[PDB]
Every structure is written in C-alpha cells, then in structure tokens.
Amino acid sequence: MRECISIHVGQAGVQIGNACWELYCLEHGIQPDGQMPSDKTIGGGDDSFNTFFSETGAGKHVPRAVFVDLEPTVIDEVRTGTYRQLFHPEQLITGKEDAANNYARGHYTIGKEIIDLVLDRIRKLADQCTGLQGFLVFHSFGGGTGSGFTSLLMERLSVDYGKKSKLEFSIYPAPQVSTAVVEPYNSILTTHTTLEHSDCAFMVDNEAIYDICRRNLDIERPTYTNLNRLISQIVSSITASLRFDGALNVDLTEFQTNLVPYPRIHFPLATYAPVISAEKAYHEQLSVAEITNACFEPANQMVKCDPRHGKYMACCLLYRGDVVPKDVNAAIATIKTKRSIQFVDWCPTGFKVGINYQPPTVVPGGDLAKVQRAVCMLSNTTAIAEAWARLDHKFDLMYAKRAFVHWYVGEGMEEGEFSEAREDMAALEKDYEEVGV
Amino acid sequence: MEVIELNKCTSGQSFEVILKPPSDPSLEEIQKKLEAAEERRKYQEAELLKHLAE
Amino acid sequence: MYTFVVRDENSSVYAEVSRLLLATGQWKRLRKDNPRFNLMLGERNRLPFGRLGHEPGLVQLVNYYRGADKLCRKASLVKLIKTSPELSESCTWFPESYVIYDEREVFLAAYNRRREGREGNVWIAKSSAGAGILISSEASELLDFIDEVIQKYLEKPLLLEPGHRKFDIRSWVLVDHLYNIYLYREGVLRTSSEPYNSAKTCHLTNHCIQKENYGRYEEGNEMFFEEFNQYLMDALNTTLENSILLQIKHIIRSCLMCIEPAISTKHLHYQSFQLFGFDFMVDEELKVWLIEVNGAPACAQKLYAELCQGIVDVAISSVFPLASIFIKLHHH
Amino acid sequence: MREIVHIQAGQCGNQIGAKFWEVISDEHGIDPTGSYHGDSDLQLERINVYYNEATGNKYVPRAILVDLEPGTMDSVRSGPFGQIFRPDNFVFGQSGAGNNWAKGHYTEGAELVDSVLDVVRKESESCDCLQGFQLTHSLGGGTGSGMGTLLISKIREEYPDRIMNTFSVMPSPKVSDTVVEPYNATLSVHQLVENTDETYCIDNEALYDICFRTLKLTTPTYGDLNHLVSATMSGVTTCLRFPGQLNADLRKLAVNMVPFPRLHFFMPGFAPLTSQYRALTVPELTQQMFDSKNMMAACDPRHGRYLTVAAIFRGRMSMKEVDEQMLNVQNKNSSYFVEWIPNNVKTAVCDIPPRGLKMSATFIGNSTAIQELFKRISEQFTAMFRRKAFLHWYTGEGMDEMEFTEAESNMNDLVSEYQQYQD
Ligand SMILES: Nc1nc2c(ncn2[C@@H]2O[C@H](COP(=O)(O)OP(=O)(O)OP(=O)(O)O)[C@@H](O)[C@H]2O)c(=O)[nH]1
Ligand SMILES: Nc1ncnc2c1ncn2[C@@H]1O[C@H](COP(=O)(O)OP(=O)(O)CP(=O)(O)O)[C@@H](O)[C@H]1O
Ligand SMILES: Nc1nc2c(ncn2[C@@H]2O[C@H](COP(=O)(O)OP(=O)(O)O)[C@@H](O)[C@H]2O)c(=O)[nH]1
Ligand SMILES: [Ca+2]
Ligand SMILES: [Ca+2]
Ligand SMILES: [Ca+2]
Ligand SMILES: [Mg+2]
Ligand SMILES: [Mg+2]
Ligand SMILES: [Mg+2]
Fold first, then answer.
1. Number of domains comprising chain C
2. After which residues is chain D broken (C to N over 2.5 A)?
3. Which domain-ending residue is among C29, C62, C95?
C-alpha cells in the first residue's frame, strides 16, 4: 500500500476538495466523525482506502489532505462544515488577504511568504507515509492563488519530492461563472511554469460542467455546489482505482504510463455518462452500450471540443456499477463501426478497461440520481488543444494592448514572463498539431 | 478484437481490448527568482517614496 | 436582431447572402473580429472552428462544415472513395483514379492490362494546385509532369449537337445544420465551344479556359436545364430527369451520407451548413460520372438571386427565424 | 475581516458621506444609536467591512469626518444618525478654505492634516487586515478638493500597498458656488490620476439634469442631488458589504476594472429613477441601467467605448433572466465594448434590495467617453487661465502659475490617453 496526499489550493480547489472528501466518505462508509464501522483493523492497516485516509488509535479515519487558501473564509467552511471532525487544524492553512485574481501576487508576493509553511504541513503528512506515491493538486486556472501559488508549490514539490508523481485537477476558466477578466493571463502563466512539473493534468472547463448541469439536471442557473457535486463524481471515477481493489491505474505512475506517451501532452480529456436528474422519479437505466456511446458525444465531455478532428494517443474506460466485460466489448465493436476514432500511427488502437462493481455513490438529497452503472472515459486527444487555442487567443487580444499588465509588473513580475509563457503555449499548440495531423 | 490481461478480483475486473496494432530548477534558482521579484517591488516602492518626498 | 460577420471578401455567393440579410432589417453586421455573432461567413483556409460555440447566450452558425475538405480535395476524394466501405472503391460512378506524390506501382499495374488488351489507355493528371493539367496516353509523360492524382480520361463523352462538343454539369447542393441535403433545382452545363477531337481546348470545359469560338452557341458557354432537357427529348427521346438526374441525386447522397458521421454538427456546441459544387461528366451511354466536389463554388450569374435567397431561407432563417427551389434528397 | 476606512472631507464630502452612512446603516439594520435591529444574518455577515464593534454589541462606523470649518460637521452631529459616529473621529479646524485649493492643499490644510492622519492610524491599527480607504469629497471647493488630495498623498506615503478609492463630485456651472471651481477641479484631478486606484466620477451636471429632466424637479436642491448619490454609493458598495463572488473587495474590483493605471475613472449609473409602487422588470432594469439618462457623469457612452463594466442587481429576481438581459445588451450593442478585452462585462446579484425598492440595478462603467467630463473641465479652466483670471487668490497662497500650467497639461494628457484607446 502506497499513500497519496491531496492538496487543495484556492477557493476552487478547496470547495472541490470538500465535495470529493464528502463523496469519499459516503463511498467508503466513513461517518462525519471519522469513524468507519466496516474497518476492523482499528488504528492502522494497509487497505486500499488507506492510500487516502490515515487511522488514529481512536478509530478516526483522517484524510491525507492539505487545504491552502490566502483568504480564510473558504477554508472556514471546512472548519465548521459537516465533516469538520475529519480534519485536524494542522491540515488547514489560511492567509490574511488573497491574491486578488493576480498570478504575480499569488506566486511572488504572497507565495514567498507562505510557501515554507505549506511545505512544512505537507511534510508532516509525508512522515506518516510508509511509501508515498505522490500528490493530487486541485486548483483553478483563473484565480490568483489557484494559478500563482500552485505553480510555486509544484516547483517546490519537484524539489522536495523529486521521485514522486504529481497529478492535477484544474478548473479551466469560463466567463459564464468566472470572476475576473485577467483569467486568461493567469491560466497561461500557470500552465507555463507548471508544465514541466505535472505528470498528468485533468482539465475541467466550467463551461462544460455548467451546460451539463443545465441540460441534464434541469438546473436553470447552476451554482458552484451543483458544479462541484458533478466534478467530484468525475474525480471519484478517476481516483477510485487508488482507493479500491483493482488492477488498472492502481498507482499514480500508471496514469502517466497509460495516458501520457509524450510528457508535454499530459492533458487527458474526460467524458462522463450518465448524468440523470434526481427530480426524475423514474428514468430508464442506460445500458453498457448506451453509456459507452455517450462517451463519444461532445456534450458529455469535461472540455467541449471535437475528437473527430484530432487523433487519439490513449483511451481508458472506467466503469462503475453493473458492468461485465462482455457488454463492454460488444459496445466497443459497435462504436468502432459508427464513430470516427482515429489513433496515431505509433500507438495501438485499443481501450484499457476497468470495472468496479460498486455503483456510483451520490450525495443524499443532491441533484444527481442514483444509476445502476456509469462510465468515465479518459482519452488523450489532440482535440483538447482547442481549449489552448481559445485561451491563447484571448491572451493575445489583451496582451497586444498590454491591458492589465501593470498589475503583474507591480508585484515584481517582469513583462518578459508574459511573452515567455505565451511562446511556450505556442510551442504546445504546435506539438498537438504535429501529433494530430 | 483481442482481449488481453484480464485481472479479476472481488470488487471488479480490468482488461485491455485491442482493435488494431500500431503502424528541474534547483531550490537556489527558485529562491533567486523569488528574491528578484521582491527586490523589484522594493525598488518600485523606493521610487514612489522618493517621488512623494519631492 | 441577429448578428453576423464576414471573413471572406472574395465569396461572390455570400457577398449576396450578406446583402440580403441587411435588406431584411433584422440582421446586423459586425466587425470581422467581433466574436459576439450569431452567424459566421468564414474564410476558406484555417477557419477557427475551435473558437465557435463558446459564447454564452449565442446560438452560433457557420457556413462551412469542418472536415468537408476530405470530399473537396483531389487526393482526399480518391482516398475517401477507395477506403470507405459505403463507396467500396468499386462504385460505378467514379472514374478509376490513383494518387501520385503512394500508388505508382498500382497505377502502372492496370495501365499495362489496358494497352495490351487494345483498350483505350488515355489518362489525365491533375491536382488541387491548378488554375496545370496534362492529358496523354503514355504514362511516362504524365509522371514527368508530376515530378516538376491521375484518373481515367473519359474518351467517350456525350457530345452536344450541333457542335460535336464536350460539356460538364455543375450541381449546387446545400446541406443545412440538420444534414438535410437540398439539391438546387437549377444547374448549368459549362460547354466547350470547340469540336471534340480525340486525336486541346475542346477537352477542358472550364469557363475560364473557354473564354481565353467562345459564346457562339449559348450565352457564355452556359446551357441551363430547360434547354438541355429539351435537347435530350429531341435528340435522344428522353428527359434530363430520367437519363441523368437520377444518377446525379444518387451520387450526391452517396458522397454526403458517407462523411456524415465525421462532419455532422448534430450534438455540437455550434452548427454548420455548407453550399457545395458537384461536377459531373456524361458519357455517350448516358452514364453520369463524378469528377470533383467544390467546397467554395461560385454560382451562375442568372441564378445568384434565386440560390442566395434559398440559402437565407433554409440554411440561415431556419436557425434564426425572421418576423421550393430545392429538391430534398431524403436519407436516413 | 477585510476592513475599509472611510474619510469624508469638506462640506460636500461630509454631507454626502453622512447620507451614505444613513443609507447603509438602515440596510444593515443599525439604528442611530449603533444597535443592530435587523432580521437577517446577511446584514451582519460582512458588517465589519464598514463598522467596528464596541462594548454592548454596538456597531461604530469606521468613518473619519474632516473639515476646515466646524459648520457642516456640526450639522452632521445634529443630523439623524449624528450620534453614531465616534466623537474622536471628528477632526475640524476653524479657518475654512474659502473654495481655495491652495488653502486646502498648502496653507490652511497642512496645519490640520497631521491630526487627521493620527485618527487614520488609530483606525488602521485596530484592523485585522485593512483593505484600504474610501474618500468622499468634491473637487470644486477647497477642503474636500485641496485638503482631500493632500490627505490622499499622505495616506499613500504611509500605506503604499493599500487601495485608495474616492467618490469625487465634479463641479458644473449648472450647480456652481464660485467661478474658481474649474481651477480647483483641474488641480485635484491630477492628484487623483496619480494617487487613487478607483474614482467614481459624480458629475453635478448629471445629477441636476436627472433631477430636472427625469425626476421632474424644477428647482433641485443639494438634498435632491445627494439622494441620487446615496443610492449610487449604496449600489457600488453592495459587493463589498454583502456576501458575493464578484468584486468582493477593493483590490479585486481594481484588477477587474482598471486595464491601465491612469484610466481609473468610472461612470456610475442607477436604476430605477422614478418620479413609484410599480414593479420594475429585469429587462427594464437592464435597459435603464445602460441608458445615458441614468449615468451620473454627464457623458454619452455612445460617444466612447467601454473598457470594462460592472453591473450589480439587487432584489429577488430571476438570475437566469438577469443573465439573458445582460447578454442581450452586449450582443445588441457589441460595437460599444472594446474587443481587445474579452468578456469585460461582469454581473453580480444581491438578494437584499435598497430601502423602498423591490429591485434595483447599479452600473459601474470604465468608458472612454469619460474624456468628455475632463474636456468640459479643461475648457472652463482654459477660458479663465488664458487671461490669468482669479489667479491672485492662489498666488496669494504661494502657488506659481507653472503649477497651473502643469495641471492643465496633465489633464489634456489624460484626455489624449482616453482617445487613443477609443480608436
Ligand atoms: N467549478 C468550480 N469553479 C470555481 C469554484 N470556485 C471558483 N471557481 C472558478 O475559479 C476561478 C477563480 O479562481 P478562485 O479559485 O476562486 O481564486 P483563488 O484560487 O481563491 O485565488 P484568489 O485570487 O486569491 O482569490 C473562476 O474562473 C471561477 O469560475 C468552484 O467552487 N467550483
Ligand atoms: N476523367 C475525365 N474524363 C474527361 N474529362 C475530364 C476528366 N477529368 C477532368 N475532365 C475535364 O476537366 C474539367 C474539370 O477539371 P477540374 O474540375 O479538375 O479543374 P478545376 O477544379 O480547376 C475546375 P472547377 O472550378 O469546377 O473546380 C472538366 O471540364 C472535364 O471536361
Ligand atoms: N452633490 C453635491 N455637491 C455639493 C454639495 N455641497 C457642495 N457641493 C459642490 O461642491 C463644490 C463646492 O465644494 P465644497 O464641498 O462646498 O467646498 P469645501 O467644503 O471647501 O470642500 C461645488 O461644485 C458644489 O456644487 C452637496 O451637498 N452635494
Ligand atoms: Ca484499518
Ligand atoms: Ca518531476
Ligand atoms: Ca493658522
Ligand atoms: Mg480566493
Ligand atoms: Mg476545384
Ligand atoms: Mg461650500
């Protein structure tokens, strides 16, 4: 058994982490006070769920998690929330004033003053680990803390834990819920300095979650709570193999091996199905073929793009529920004759499949209906470069007039870091075009 | 349409289905960049206070 | 009040479409780089499809199908017909074609069996970088032209009389956002004004080559469907619908239904439509052959008004309603 | 605990500042004695942004009242909410400034500025994390204009990393006290270009036109003008005073609203402006909010282009319908929003509406049309200055003509900087 430490940075990271650990507790039968009646080894053990939870002698199951925010109001939601008894105060780290949607403020000005404190609290969790796998970092692209302090933390984690893997869950900015005009700046600044430090990053476009909540859950104006409930389902699908018995994606290294052949192209596209409204008293349970087919509809992707105009480098199917391999193969053979699924010439055209028999867990009273089976597809498509192209265009528009650039220079950042970060993204777009055509 | 590496356990199973065969900066350098930006902030504030003293 | 942008100043078709939208008083044109549009009359090359459908509260429509170049390129069409089981390579309506940069050994394979069996062994070479085309019966001459797409030259074309002259049929096809296939009821025959000599200009029926005996028989070397149908009745005792138009509708449906899974915007964050230009050849046995597909075609001068209005009716106003000249080729 | 320190200086600043505290105390349920008598936890959740807490669960505004004459501040202490202000925070002189920028900035004002800074220091010392400062003042007089800008410069020297925000009342010949107001305003504007991060431009010409044309008031008074400023000041601070995600503090507002450091002068707008029980729909709020007749700066937005826009909706309404109408205004007039700043219109919604309104809308726009306000002031300045008219009032206080010439050049630069981004 090898441990995984989760790090949640900024408002988006903390609120999403809160939604994940709630879901984890429901999935593992852990009560809000930390007790877990099904766990018979009291005070220890090396089960699969221990990769995410430590155990005290009193029987409490403590998340291997650290929450960081430069403003205390979001983390105070954890201190007084339903699951406050899970975390001890050392795991929650707050500052006085935030980064004000400024990458430079979160990375240089305030990051410098708090980076040692965060690392020290992370070190305390690592000392409890008999064999640390690595870290899962939850953060936004557009926030000053989520972009600025994360990229500093990722650099320092590569220094203090060089042999450890690092995975990202990143919130891509969408103007329908975004809080700042300079979020394209922060997104590109943080992708530039984090790129060489993240082994595999899962991008979640808020635009996609928003429309899935409107279209499938009949939410007229979705809130962060609606978005985070859905996002935690996808995150749980991805991390379920680390927390349960299995053979696919059983350690963080296997994510890179199965999804990232080219290290810079480490942004798998996630697609999730089905998303059923809980207000529906009775909905027809979709088959294996139907939920597998839905994995190739753009309307269910975590980032809107067209995989048809792109090539695949890898493709994992993560099923949860009443699924057997026979139905999976029958569905794949059918989909191959109806869908445009072009792989690159230097990779096998195939699917790594994982099935966990426990059906998805939903938060009681939430908006997601319990389903008998669900699937999350992780596919490395060059089509996800479309999201980079959108982001880079908005950057080019503002930077041509140097709009808002003085806010970053005022924090000690040089204007050259902008163009340096932009040229990296241009190189990244070029890599996708070479692989995709 | 080949199914390989079928691993079964009590809580599920995993396998691979094939359809077609194919055809860091040091701690010092980080502290240098952080201290460089702080010094650039200190310089801009000194110029402001010099301007305000005038 | 709907909004649209214009990103192709050379499109004669959509310059008129843009003109009609403004006449309705309910369509406002924006700057070419304004992203808050409902409609994009985009550019022919490097259209940023990846930036469409990301504007909240805006239903966005574009006048090109992403991926339709596979049908509207010389080598792409040949590869598509050979590799697609729907077209099965052995489809009767496409001349035996080969792509040369590869299919050099395959092209010379069937070439030897033709000249040995006393059969007509005349081929034609072309590519998408033309106004440069070579026609010859010796393969060595053709291959020397490429080193500076080869298909069988139809040596037995249907010749119009009086004149003993070649022609080609242009059909305009509109595919809307629901992938309905609308065939414009009006077509044109771009005729050669020179007698066909199977032993230069009388072989290429392009409107730019004939103008460079032009304009003798019909105005502008363009014969419309009414006169051509009348000639078929008087000369061959048959109609344009029976002898030719059934095969044209079959070829259009085959090509467009084949690529439908790859380009359809059915469940996509933006919708597409596109006007197409199919070019057909007719042999002396009244068999129709597909030559090429144009993704950015021009219209006949007499037909700009009708067709461009039809584009506004079924392709634009169907998505953005305000306050039939087409034949719907039904399909599954 | 992201505290703001409020300062009001001069006659206009203190009369407008008093009405501001009168309005938001009612919204937060604070009675004239400092006791909370509300019925919602939303009222107290961000109460510490503007109020300190004393013994007996008393809420004391974090406000500092400044003037060189005791008169207007005696009226404040005798006003409705007069007893709610901290008595030590009344800092006044006796000589006055005589509508003279030089007296407020150089002679009479310097004698008093240090004791104001002593009170500012005492408020900031008991702040968990001071965001910055907001100042209310006019630019046409002497204390608010001359001493207000002196205060701002000395606050920046002592708190160089805090945000400085001002509500600045622009003079107008329509509502004028003396002819030297263009001189006083031109001198102050250059100070504001350098030493504030955000300035709400409140034009007395616009306030008068709205009272006369729209509200149907043939003889508007300062009280009538200040009613519009109260409603506007309450609206633009809603995001600071109540829980929310957008522009929740002064620095995030500046990052969203200011693409260039010198172009930080905002046009505020309010809706409705009824001359009254009729319920206003969301489309009506959005159309009026963007109408020039609802702007407080007397500039035509159609004569310029929006750099950034912030819209705040108050009341219980459909947030879906709010988004549809906001997206409708932009998509139907996209030529007036600059294309080189994508998605530069941000919208916030707050359930608590102002007093006596089911719902309202507040507009904060950084438009390049604001150059019309500075052009107007610049012309009135030049009309007198080309003949050195009334300059003796200022040279008598030690100022040189060169300082006026430099202030004139600086404001023409500001106009030119707005013009280049309009193109
Ligand atoms: N899906 C989702 N997105 C969020 C959430 N909270 C914020 N965001 C997005 O994150 C971006 C803003 O970044 P934040 O995380 O809020 O900012 P921050 O990391 O706290 O950094 P600061 O600037 O210091 O506040 C916007 O694009 C929001 O849409 C959340 O709970 N769920
Ligand atoms: N296999 C074949 N047999 C007979 N004629 C042929 C032929 N292939 C091409 N042609 C002649 O070539 C002409 C079409 O050339 P092609 O369409 O390749 O050039 P082009 O694409 O520049 C004209 P367009 O504007 O329609 O795209 C027709 O007039 C036809 O007569
Ligand atoms: N809107 C408004 N403007 C005022 C008020 N009092 C004065 N003014 C304006 O402010 C300018 C005079 O400044 P004033 O505040 O009286 O001078 P000060 O006391 O020395 O700062 C003129 O332009 C007046 O029109 C007021 O109560 N409301
Ligand atoms: Ca145990
Ligand atoms: Ca590494
Ligand atoms: Ca004195
Ligand atoms: Mg934050
Ligand atoms: Mg062509
Ligand atoms: Mg006065």
1. 2
2. 275
3. C62
Taking contacts as CB-CB distances below 8 angstroms, the residues of chain A near B14 are: 246-248, 352-355
End-to-end CA distance of chain A: 42
Q: Residue A335, Cα to own-chain centre: how many angstroms? A: 27
Best mutation target among C269, C270, C271, C272 (most A Cβ atoms within 10 Å) is C269
Backbone Cα Rg of chain B: 30
The contacts of residue A395 (CB under 8 Å, 6+ apart) are A184, A185, A188, A422, A425
Provide CATH code, domain D266-372. 3.30.1330.20
CATH topology of domain A3-259: Rossmann fold (3.40.50)
User: Using an 8 Å Cβ cutoff, are D179 and D193 in contact?
Assistant: no
- Cβ neighbours of C67 in A, within 8 Å: 308-309
Q: Which of residues 1-54 of B touch D (CB under 8 A)?
A: 45, 48-49, 52
Catalytic-residue membership of A254: yes
Q: Quick one: resolution in A? A: 2.3
**Domain regions of chain A by residue span:** 3-259, 269-386
DSSP D390: T
Q: With contact defined as beta carbons under 8 Å apart, do D202 and D170 qualify? A: yes
The answer for residues whose C-beta is within 8 angstroms of residue A182's C-beta and 6 or more apart is A101, A102, A398, A404, A407, D255, D256
Residue nearest to atom 31 of ligand 1 (CA): A12
For domain D2-265, the CATH architecture is 3-Layer(aba) Sandwich (3.40)
Q: Residue C37 is part of a domain; what is its CATH number?
A: 3.40.50.11480
On whether residue C245 sits in a domain, the answer given is yes
Helices (H) and strands (E) in chain B, counts: 1, 2
Domain ranges across chain D: 2-265, 266-372, 373-422
Per DSSP, what are the bridge partners of residue D137? Answer: D168
Residue C175 lies in domain = 68-71+157-329
Phi (first) and psi of residue D150, to 5 degrees: -65, -45
CA of A56 to the centre of ligand 4 (A): 9
Q: Which residues contact C282 (CB under 8 A, 6 or more apart)?
A: C157, C158, C167, C169, C244, C288, C289
Q: Name residue D419's amino acid.
A: Q
Which three-class secondary structure string do you get for chain C? CEEEEECCCCCHHHHHHHHHHHHCCCEEECCCCCCCCCEEECCCCCCCHHHCCCCCCCCCEECCCCCHHHCCCHHHHHHHHHHCCCCCCCCCCCCCEECCCCCHHHHHHHHHHHHHCCCCCCEEECCCCCCCCEEECCHHHHHHHHCCCEEECCCCECCECCCCEEEEEEEEEEECCCCCEEEECCCEEEEEEEECCCCCCCCCCCHHHHHCCCCCCCHHHEEEHHHHHHHHHHHHCCCHHHHHHHHHHHHHHHHHHHHHHHHCCCCCCCEECEEEEEEEEEECCCCEEEEEEECCCCCCHHHHHHHHHHHHHHHHCCCCCCCCCEEEECCC
Q: Is residue C274 part of a domain?
A: yes
Closest ligand by atom to C71 CA: 8
D33 by DSSP, 3-state: which? coil
Q: Which CATH superfamily is domain D373-422 in?
A: Helix hairpin bin (1.10.287.600)
Q: Which residues pair with D366 in a beta bridge?
A: D308
Looking at C14, C37, C62, the residue that finishes a domain is: C62
Domain A269-386 falls under CATH 2.60.40.10 = no
